[PDB]
């Protein structure tokens, strides 16, 4: 057996890496956590430091409030009996207000009120986390590609829980907070709209989801195959092409007739993943607002 | 034509079969013995699909659909127009996919690189074979396989899934989906991270790998590292396809009920199945 | 022609523009295409070359502008073996010494890669303030065995990527007392030895040497890793 570079053979450790400083406010960095030998077989062993500023604290607090709001509901649905809690944990569900309430915020607590409180907490948690991904990159002088990619995921979540219900006329169209119930919601969504397989934006979304697994399999395997020439040091291969970048390009050129560069493959990658939730959000947005039956809609076109 | 750095790599050697007989390029494409094999299986499979289009009586690609044999044919051969073309096309596709993998091995050898890429591609071939070979044989009929048509094969997914209730409740399906979602999340983050270092703010020098590690520690308290992320992308995508094949090989072979039943074991344990209220009492 | 129709049509036009941008971004190295004699090919394809972009390299190392006029900057000891294109080019010497085929190296800069602070990224442990082995088999002092099953030498140090806390090269002392670097990814650290499948014992001395005992430049890494990987093809009469 030749070494495959899937797991590290020999771990080394030095003083803890405190990281680049740039324009980061060092007051808000934690100390260093423990080194993990276990993780060190697959990647880096160091844990921490983490950065915890105002937006991070706002996000963690909000997110826990969202979590606690759902859990308190689950305890109440379990008659406060811990055994029913664990037994039916996957079955409990914090559902939205009934359609009678329209877009009102005056549903009683047990009849959709708590869902609206939970969703608010989730709204604050996600958007303040997004602000964090922007500012953490700005403080280090980096491009904003991570915040822009996160926006694509946020888009689908916003359409599911906020934009589409608003255009439909009722919070009852939103997604419940529950393991099994949100699955049942997804299934009923497709049934109600005439089979989501025939929503071409759903088709596009699937092609990119599959395409993302295809591309990361290709790119992860390619980089491991040229790690024997330092291939994973992708930034310096961008600044000064080495035999790793040439052989990686030539494998794919000889195999399928064209190739990428060490920088350009990361543009293929970011766009392949981002298009999943981009196309998906559009397809959900048009369902019930413009198109009631995708199969029938599909029939009268291609 | 050659890339500007390509000539020095175009040496003889590395083939598995045929010596220097097929050791050459057509344009950018390397040939090799398994390039010839790939052409053979693909061309013939394309001819058959053309034949099946004539028998079907349509030239539009959205209507062409090559069906497998009726369930009554069991695991036996079928006449061409009654499930036989599907059988021969499946033979040619399998040959093409496997030939492609062995051509990649030869290219790996001429370039002196690891074999990770054909090894990863083999997982996709195994998923395909799970649906058209392993599962149908285990259930006893070629007609449990999917049809070769753009829209008919979507209908097959829906037919098969709803046969078992809401397929969402298949627990190996849950794990597969989790890997697919986590993969696209990791891919978006990795592409973004590298581009954000090579293309930093206006007025700045290129960032270093230490900035990438620092960004992710600041963000979530851990950086997997430049090698680990490519290990991780490989792991996530292959695990997604492994559990996909697993979730299908067990459906109709060791499980026949509505998948939501599987969890009702957790619900009807004798030490809490009878407690009133809640959801399951 | 409803709104959903307009949207799906619009998306496909956006997708085609995206594909055209992505493909041109991926032609910043290695293009224009050349003929096998090195003159530019007549058929360059339907995508044009992108307009140049510039990278400002850290630590005062200059700028990079791509695409730009390309050059191998090294002799290539190969000869054309056919009038028609599409056939292999054959080595005119020793392909492992001449660095062609799977033994190829690229003329990268003869400078070490630096970390975020401007210090050498890769260092021998004995110069690496505070570094040490933490898990797995410590190979220092182990003997190094080639694919001929003879011993070539023994491990006298580990070269570590400081910022990423990773072992990248083994430093191996040969019978004459000189040393060579061996890429971590091409060795198997076993309980009683380091085994190297790519090279026979008598090919270790031909691993290219580095000019300083405490740093390795990008050019040196490419020559070293190219040489070692070329042994998979060219040391095969000894495997
Ligand atoms: C994986 C689990 C299911 C399944 C469930 C679904 C669902 C659900 C959907 C699809 C969709 C598609 N599936 Mg399917 N599909 C399966 C098996 C297959 C196989 C196969 C040989 O195993 C193939 C070739 C396809 C092919 C396709 C495409 C037509 C389409 C987008 C895929 C994509 O971009 O992926 C990622 C790959 C890439 C980006 C790279 C390019 C791949 C190219 C485009 C594939 C083209 C094949 C060509 C049409 C047929 C051969 C032509 C030759 C000339 C003979 N499916 C099995 C049965 N598939 C979607 C759709 O819209 O269908 C109409 C969709 O919504
Ligand atoms: C019976 C069920 C229906 C169906 C109903 C639906 C519905 C309904 C939807 C999908 C959607 C999707 N479907 Mg479908 N689907 C069916 C059949 C399939 C088949 C198949 C084999 O046939 C496949 C492969 C797919 C595949 C897919 C995906 C391409 C797509 C979701 C993208 C994604 O990444 O979402 C995952 C990503 C997100 C939800 C974004 C999340 C972002 C937020 C910001 C994250 C917050 C995290 C939170 C704070 C918690 C943090 C915790 C801390 C980490 C501790 N479907 C059938 C026809 N499908 C979606 C879509 O886009 O449709 C067009 C969708 O809404
Ligand atoms: C639609 C009704 C059911 C359902 C029923 C099923 C059924 C039934 C199945 C799945 C399967 C899958 N489902 Mg489900 N599923 C549903 C809802 C979902 C949802 C969701 C959000 O609701 C999601 C995300 C998923 C997700 C998934 C994946 C785990 C998996 C498909 C990928 C796969 O196996 O690829 C594997 C990859 C391949 C098969 C591709 C192989 C390609 C080959 C090797 C080469 C092709 C080459 C090409 C022809 C060459 C062309 C020429 C070039 C273009 C130049 N399902 C609902 C509840 N689901 C499938 C599965 O697990 O399969 C194992 C499956 O059969
Ligand atoms: C391109 C599309 C894909 C995508 C992209 C994407 N997601 C992203 C980003 C990007 C580019 C980010 O930058 C961002 C991120 O920070 O990544 C690390 C994010 C992210 N995507 C996430 C999740 C996520 N993304 C998903 C999907 C996808 N994301 C798409 C597939 C999914 C699903 C359903 O598939 C999920 C669940 C997060 C990891 C992160 C957003 C973080 C965030 O918004 O947090 C707000 C909430 C909190 C801060 C608090 C949550 C609290 C917990 C719910 C409970 C705690 C329990 C208990 C008290 C503690 C446990 C303790 C024990 C461990 C000791
Ligand atoms: C395991 C992780 C993912 C993966 C990985 C992966 N795929 C790969 C590789 C890797 C590592 C390659 O190296 C290889 C490649 O070369 O990529 C460019 C490949 C590849 N994955 C491809 C497609 C593909 N991969 C997919 C999936 C995945 N690939 C996984 C999710 C999917 C889907 C549906 O999810 C598709 C469509 C190809 C682009 C390529 C393999 C090319 C190949 O084999 O070429 C030889 C064959 C031909 C030229 C044609 C043969 C034609 C048949 C004889 C007739 C048609 C038969 C077919 C059954 C009809 C189907 C009709 C549909 C409507 C159902
Ligand atoms: C870091 O690194 C990285 C890179 O790089 C730096 C990369 O690039 C890549 C690669 C990734 C990308 C480029 C990104 C884009 C890729 C995707 C989005 C994934 C999706 C991919 C596709 C959809 C493309 C798929 C296309 C395929 C599968 C190839 C198409 C195939 C053909 C057109 C057919 C040709 C191929 C065949 C059949 C093989 C055999 C070759 C032949 C020509 C057939 C044989 C012909 C003959 C027999 C002729 C014989 C002639 C004779 C005998 C006469 C000779 C003459 C005499 C005089 C004697 C990655 C991952 C990477 O991480
Ligand atoms: C011991 O247990 C305790 C009590 C400690 C617990 O806390 C137990 C905790 C649990 C058991 C956790 C249970 C949690 C879950 C099961 C989570 C499941 C969640 C999902 C499956 C999410 C599915 C989708 C969610 C969506 C789509 C949300 C959308 C949100 C909206 C976009 C936000 C809308 C905001 C509104 C309406 C407020 C308006 C705001 C303005 C500014 C006007
Ligand atoms: C009406 C329907 C349209 C969609 C609605 C809005 C959805 C939100 C989605 C946002 C766009 C998707 C992400 C863009 C691609 C990923 C990022 C990218 O590659 O470009 C960013 C790049 O420049 C770097 O940013 P800078 O450092 O600031 O230049
Ligand atoms: C021949 C094909 C013609 C197709 C028809 C015409 C075009 C169709 C419509 C739309 C095409 C949209 C292409 C968008 C390309 C992405 C542009 C982009 O991303 O710009 C920002 C980018 O610099 C940031 O650079 P970095 O910060 O360095 O990453
Ligand atoms: C205080 C300690 C708290 C620790 C809590 C840790 C939770 C996150 C763990 C794994 C997420 C990994 C996601 C992988 C995506 C990384 C994308 C990438 O490219 O990273 C490369 C590397 O990090 C630089 O190059
Ligand atoms: C960024 C790479 C682009 C990948 C292109 C993917 C093409 C998939 C086409 C699927 C077609 C879906 N639909 C319903 C419109 O036919
Ligand atoms: C769905 C992703 C596939 C998109 C296909 C892009 C085709 C690129 C072909 C570029 C031609 C390369 N060449 C020969 C000019 O060097
Ligand atoms: C579903 C569409 C798939 C498109 C596959 C494109 C193949 C392109 C091969 C490029 C070869 C160009 C060589 C010209 C010298
Ligand atoms: C008398 C023989 C009748 C059975 C023929 C079955 C052909 C279809 C099976 C597909 C096999 C795909 C894998 C081939 C290696
Ligand atoms: C089902 C067809 C299999 C085709 C052969 C796949 C090639 C496998 C590569 C062999 C080497 C793997 C070593 C990497 C771990
Ligand atoms: Fe990468």
Author numbering:
A (entry chain M): 1 to 302
B (entry chain L): 1 to 281
C (entry chain H): 10 to 248
What did the original publication write about this model?
The RC from the purple bacterium Rhodobacter sphaeroides is an integral membrane pigment–protein complex that consists of three subunits and ten cofactors. Only one, the A branch, is active in photosynthetic electron transfer. The RC includes two bacteriochlorophylls (BChls), PA and PB, combined into a special pair P, two monomeric BChls BA and BB, two bacteriopheophytins (BPhe) HA and HB, two quinones and a nonheme Fe atom [Allen et al., 1987; Fig. 1(a)]. Being the primary electron donor, the BChl dimer P is a crucial component in the RC, and the redox potential of P is a critical factor in the efficient functioning of the RC.
To explore the structural consequences of the F(M197)H mutation in detail, X-ray crystal structures of the mutant RC were obtained under two different conditions: (i) cryo-conditions using a single crystal and (ii) multi-crystal crystallography at room temperature. It is important to mention that there is a significant difference between the F(M197)H mutant structures obtained at 100 K and at room temperature. In both of these structures we observed a rotation of the acetyl group of BChl PB relative to the plane of the macrocycle that differs from that seen in the WT structure, but in the case of the room-temperature mutant there was a more pronounced rotation compared with the cooled structure. For further comparison, the structures of the WT and mutant RCs obtained at room temperature were selected, since these conditions are closer to physiological. We assume that the energy of the P Q y transition in the mutant RC could be affected both by the rotation of the C2-acetyl group of PB and by a small increase in the distance between the two BChls of the dimer, and as a result of these opposing effects the position of the P Q y band in the absorption spectrum of the mutant RC remained practically unchanged.
